[PDB]
Design a binder for this molecule. Structure first.
Ligand SMILES: CCCCCCCC/C=C\CCCCCCCC(=O)O
Lengths: 338, 56, 225, 230, 290
């Protein structure tokens, strides 16, 4: 019974390995070897956002590519204009132990969460003129690590109880539970069509979930340690992960394989955040060595370095128009690069 | 419920071992095509002129 | 503001008021003492909270000094992913029960509970996030130890112990083991107190330890220590 | 969200009078406040502004030296002290709330108005009244003596509607943006010094006087007002 | 009968050969230490200690000209250098001493309150302001007079300090030493004694509560000793280093009515050089990184 099922599971892992190997006719490095390189990517700090008095843990761009939201351990969630550096809102939190925040694509709401196991959703557009709590979503039994809005008045959250959840905000109840991880779920990323999403966890694995069905479509492995960050490739057919073993990896959803590894010999610090440029040719990654690296996504070369932060870089984002990159770190400053 | 968990793993592998896959070279070519097609629209790969850059 | 419109100027004034409020809330926040509560199962943490799910935060005032005590014992997730959130706390209050020397864990009947307590203690002392964070060690339930020590020698948990099976020697032996688990002697200070469920001086002891920690921190900051 | 003005009545010429406004249902201290008065000629004149932090205060050049605007946040009260009252100060006085940040609506809610009786960028609306029938579209024009398009890309034009017996209501902010609660039948357009408000279909509740306002620089100036008459 | 400040007839050219070495060594060492100490704080950043280094550098700006006037018997420097050379060192000395007192006050307050900018921006102004209203007699009352100094047989131009009125001289000297030397010393002593008292009170509190194992008492003793030594050195260095010039000023003041030749013309050079040496100790007593 139990032995029979375990033996059948082993044969399935063997066939999946064989099915993947049979499709590895050539590597990506053997196809992109003749592409003209991106050269050297020079970027300079254009804006510095001051006002957080503690470590900054999360940051999210608005879909207008102008408004920012950032969360810090001083209990503050600040919304920034970032063109004039003016502060638009400063929301005090009922629990200062915030680790994640998100900005609604409509611009009407923001969400946050952390060690209180509750995802709080705030209404930014009220008649009283102030920002008030609209919902408190409870039901996770671990810390909330990442949350992202969908356009259907729904939100996807991940927590330290190894599960993911799809919540209906208006009702305040879970509509879907995604189970299958064997460790803390650290990162989520939504597909451009908001129909699939990927989650990366502390069991050195990432999973592709169907947000409408609740079932896991496929599982990707290859990292040697916990995955801290995950992001989709712009066309939705690939994604990249960052882990504690100082390596980035590019995975293909249709080939069901790892394509490229991004690492170097002098980098021994973990990766906290990863993002792609608008065209997907540049991969940006934040490290614990206080710097950020720009990699050639197709040639796996280091195209540039972003430096100027005095502590660990904890969050990174790129605007929808591709015009700028925002970084945040434990020195309580946000920086915008071009 | 260890037998139940084993059955869950076996069926999840059922929904993994029997899916359509493509060749790595084709995925690489598709990524190449997407990167090249949108290369002129990337303001970070190709620096935007200062007169259109919203940040100085 | 010579290149701004009226609405831009008003937005800048709004930003300045937000700044002014943030600075005030920062100044109020910096005067509160942040204490992190760590203990093993059945270590008497409930009594320590009483005398002074997610995270639980307890606030109190003693001698016009505000304390904020954080209990993280309800979490069941990898500590290394969220323990760094508590870098910068004034002190870590660590609770160890003295009646656990001859008890074993329910999960593993062969694992002594007090050795797991020492494993947690030396995982917390020699971390990289708490290199300069002092530890206030409460050895609880001393009134339940002096009566049972006569029947259960320390050799059940400490086979290398030589001496008398009395409270006076055993308490000092356990205190020495816990204090010797530390390696950063010159930077980290452990304050050990022997208390019980009927004790009332725990608040004053915490106050004194926190006062000494703040004095040492200020001396180090002002370049005098 | 309610604003109640009080303290009006008859005042002898040369006297003094305090008007007050009590706010309820919103964060009074986060809003700046305007006093805007309507003379019996039914034109709107901006009188005074005091910011949310009381650090910025502006007056119209007709009331400088005679009027004083003030706030008391803990009572949510706005005060206007008037001295040396003249026969030209007889008007309906409206209290207006205003909040300024990226994307905000600065003239959304108006008060009800208190009656006081005593014993620059020019906005032109050449058409004083338009004969209208329900179910038809209408176009109202407004022209500025100076371009309202700022170097930051924003054009500071506002469209308000005042129904008979009611306070003015905001319809459009910054030229093209529809205010909350306003039906999508209203649309704003224009460029430079020319502005147009179009209504695809009139209903019974679209009758009244439409005003255009500039908010590029102080003092704030209103148009003459175009009336729609059934 | 008018004490020459920096002129000597002078055994020959050897004394110059050593006075041209000691002063340049003090200059180089003090400048390097202060500049290095200042920049060390530039990346460790308090705010007052930076002013201490700046005051020390402006004080040690003097050495080349005092050694130049010493290389000859006369000045040959000008009546405007005589109005600045001494007011560029008295000002800096007063600023240094008042900055030391302010640092002691802020340290004592910080310890006492168990934990702003505005106060600092004002403290610095008062410190520099008072060191330009009290040293004013030091820039107006010097004249380059030939006194026919004994031992030259010719009239020799010396930039002396003519004092037209005796009551003005006595009142200023009494006020200058008291409000510049004595008050900062008292402030430093009170501040550091209070810091030691607070530390001892806390250590007494944590001893009655029985919260120290036998083996740690040694470390506690070692720590209190180090704290005690540091504060004792900071207290005593101020008086040992700054007292000689105050005594010299009072002696020169009393040298008018007193006719015992209480001071040598050469002595005032070595006393001022000894004071210059204090800028090689200030950057290491008040910046201890070891
Ligand atoms: C607090 C004093 C610090 C000054 C340090 C610089 C040393 C001063 C050297 C020469 C200045 C003139 C000294 C004599 C001034 C008083 C003369 C007098 O009236 O007796």
């Amino acid at each position: 019974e139990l032995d029979q099922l375990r033996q059948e599971a082993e044969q399935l892992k063997n066939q999946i390995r064989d099915a993947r190997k049979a499709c590895a006719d050539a590597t990506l490095s053997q196809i992109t070897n003749n592409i003209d390189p991106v050269g050297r990517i020079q970027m300079r700090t254009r804006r510095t956002l001051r006002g957080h008095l503690a470590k900054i843990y999360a940051m999210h761009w608005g879909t207008d590519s102008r408004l920012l939201v950032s969360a810090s351990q001083d209990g503050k969630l600040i919304i920034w204009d970032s063109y004039t550096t003016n502060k638009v809102h400063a929301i005090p939190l009922r629990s200062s132990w915030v680790m994640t925040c998100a900005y609604a694509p409509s611009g009407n709401y923001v969400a946050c969460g952390g060690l209180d196991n509750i995802c709080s959703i705030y209404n930014l557009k009220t008649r009283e003129g102030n920002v008030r709590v609209s919902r408190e979503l409870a039901g996770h039994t671990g810390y909330l690590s990442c949350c992202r809005f969908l356009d259907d008045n729904q939100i996807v959250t991940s927590s330290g109880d190894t599960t993911c959840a799809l919540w209906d905000i208006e009702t305040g109840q879970q509509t879907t539970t995604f189970t299958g991880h064997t460790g803390d779920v650290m990162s989520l990323s939504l597909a451009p069509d908001t129909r699939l999403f990927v989650s990366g966890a502390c069991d050195a694995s990432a999973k592709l979930w169907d947000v409408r069905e609740g079932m896991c479509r496929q599982t990707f492995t290859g990292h040697e340690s916990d995955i801290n960050a995950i992001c989709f490739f712009p066309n939705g057919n690939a994604f990249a992960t960052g882990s504690d073993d100082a390596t980035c990896r590019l995975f293909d959803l249709r080939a069901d394989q790892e394509l490229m590894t991004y690492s170097h010999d002098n980098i021994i610090c973990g990766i906290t955040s990863v993002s792609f440029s608008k065209s997907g040719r540049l991969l940006l990654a934040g490290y614990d060595d206080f710097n950020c690296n720009v990699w050639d996504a197709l040639k796996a070369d280091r195209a540039g370095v972003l430096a100027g932060h005095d502590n660990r870089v904890s969050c990174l984002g790129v605007t929808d128009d591709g015009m700028a990159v925002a970084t945040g770190s434990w020195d309580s400053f946000l920086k915008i690069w071009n | 419920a260890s037998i139940a968990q084993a059955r869950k793993l076996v069926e999840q592998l059922k929904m993994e071992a029997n899916i359509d896959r493509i060749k790595v070279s084709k995925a690489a070519a598709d990524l190449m095509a997407y990167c090249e097609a949108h290369a002129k629209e990337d303001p970070l790969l190709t620096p935007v002129p200062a007169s259109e850059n919203p940040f100085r | 503001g010579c290149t701004l419109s009226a609405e831009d100027k008003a937005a800048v004034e709004r930003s300045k008021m937000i700044d002014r409020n943030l600075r005030e809330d920062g100044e109020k926040a910096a005067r509160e003492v942040k204490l992190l509560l760590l203990g093993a199962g059945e270590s008497g943490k409930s009594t320590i909270v009483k005398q002074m799910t997610g995270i639980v935060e307890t606030h109190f005032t003693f001698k016009d000094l505000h304390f904020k005590m954080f209990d993280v014992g309800g979490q069941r997730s990898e500590r290394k992913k969220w323990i760094h959130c508590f870098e910068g706390v004034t002190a870590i209050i660590f609770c160890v029960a003295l009646s656990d020397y001859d008890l074993v864990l329910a999960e593993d009947e062969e694992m002594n509970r007090m050795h797991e307590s020492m494993k947690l203690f030396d995982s917390i002392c020699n971390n990289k996030w708490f290199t300069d964070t002092s530890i206030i060690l409460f050895l609880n339930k001393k009134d339940l130890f002096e009566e049972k020590i006569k029947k259960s020698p320390l050799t059940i948990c400490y086979p290398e112990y030589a001496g008398s099976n009395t409270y006076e020697e055993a308490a000092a032996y356990i205190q020495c083991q816990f204090e010797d688990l530390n390696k950063r002697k010159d930077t980290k200070e452990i304050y050990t107190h022997f208390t019980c469920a009927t004790d009332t001086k725990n608040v004053q002891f915490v106050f004194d330890a926190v006062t000494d920690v703040i004095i040492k921190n200020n001396l180090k900051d002002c370049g005098l220590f | 969200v309610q604003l109640v003005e009080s303290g009006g009545g008859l005042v002898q010429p040369g006297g003094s009078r305090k008007l007050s406004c009590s706010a309820s249902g919103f964060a009074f201290s986060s809003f700046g406040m305007h006093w805007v008065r309507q003379a019996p000629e039914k034109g709107l004149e901006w009188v005074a502004y005091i910011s949310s932090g009381s650090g910025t205060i502006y007056y119209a050049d007709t009331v400088k030296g005679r009027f004083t605007i003030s706030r008391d946040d803990p009572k949510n009260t706005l005060f206007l002290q008037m001295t040396s009252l003249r026969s030209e100060d007889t008007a309906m006085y409206y209290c207006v709330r205003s909040i300024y940040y990226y994307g905000s609506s600065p003239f959304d809610f108006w008060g009800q108005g208190t009656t006081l009786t005593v014993s620059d960028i020019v906005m032109t609306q050449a058409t004083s009244s338009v004969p209208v029938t329900p179910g038809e579209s209408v176009s109202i024009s407004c022209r500025s003596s100076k371009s309202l398009l700022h170097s930051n890309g924003n054009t500071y034009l506002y469209w308000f509607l005042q129904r008979p017996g009611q306070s003015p209501q905001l319809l459009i902010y910054r030229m093209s943006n529809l205010a909350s609660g306003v039906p999508d039948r209203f649309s704003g357009s224009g460029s430079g010094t020319a502005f147009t408000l179009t209504i695809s279909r009139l209903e019974a509740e679209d009758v009244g006087v439409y005003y255009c306002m500039q908010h590029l620089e102080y003092p704030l100036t209103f148009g003459a007002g175009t009336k729609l008459e059934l | 009968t008018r004490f020459p400040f920096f002129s000597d007839v002078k055994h020959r050219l050897v004394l110059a050969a050593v006075e041209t070495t000691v002063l340049v060594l003090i200059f180089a060492v003090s400048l390097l230490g202060n500049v290095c100490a200042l920049v060390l704080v530039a990346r460790r950043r308090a705010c007052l200690v930076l002013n201490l280094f700046c005051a020390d550098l402006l004080f040690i700006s003097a050495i080349p000209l005092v050694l130049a006037v010493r290389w000859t018997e006369a000045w040959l420097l000008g009546p405007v250098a005589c109005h600045l050379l001494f007011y560029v060192m008295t000002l800096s000395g007063s600023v240094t001493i008042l900055t030391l007192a302010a640092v002691s006050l802020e340290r004592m307050v910080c310890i006492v309150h168990l934990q702003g900018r505005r106060a600092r921006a004002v403290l610095l102004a008062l410190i520099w302001g008072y060191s330009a209203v009290a040293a004013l007699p030091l820039c107006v009352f010097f004249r380059v007079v030939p006194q026919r100094l004994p031992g030259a047989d010719q009239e020799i131009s010396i930039c002396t300090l003519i004092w037209p009125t005796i009551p003005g001289e006595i009142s200023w000297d009494v006020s200058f030493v008291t409000l510049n030397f004595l008050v900062p010393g008292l402030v430093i002593v009170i501040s550091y004694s209070k810091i030691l008292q607070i530390t001892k009170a806390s250590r007494k509190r944590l001893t009655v509560s029985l919260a120290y194992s036998e083996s740690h008492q040694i470390r506690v003793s070692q720590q209190d000793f180090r704290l005690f030594r540091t504060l004792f050195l900071l207290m005593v260095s101020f008086f040992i280093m700054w007292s000689p010039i105050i005594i010299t000023i009072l002696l020169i003041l009393i040298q008018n009515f007193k006719q015992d030749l209480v001071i040598w013309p050469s002595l005032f050079f070595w006393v001022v050089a000894f004071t210059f040496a204090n800028s090689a100790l200030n950057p290491i007593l008040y910046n201890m990184t070891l």
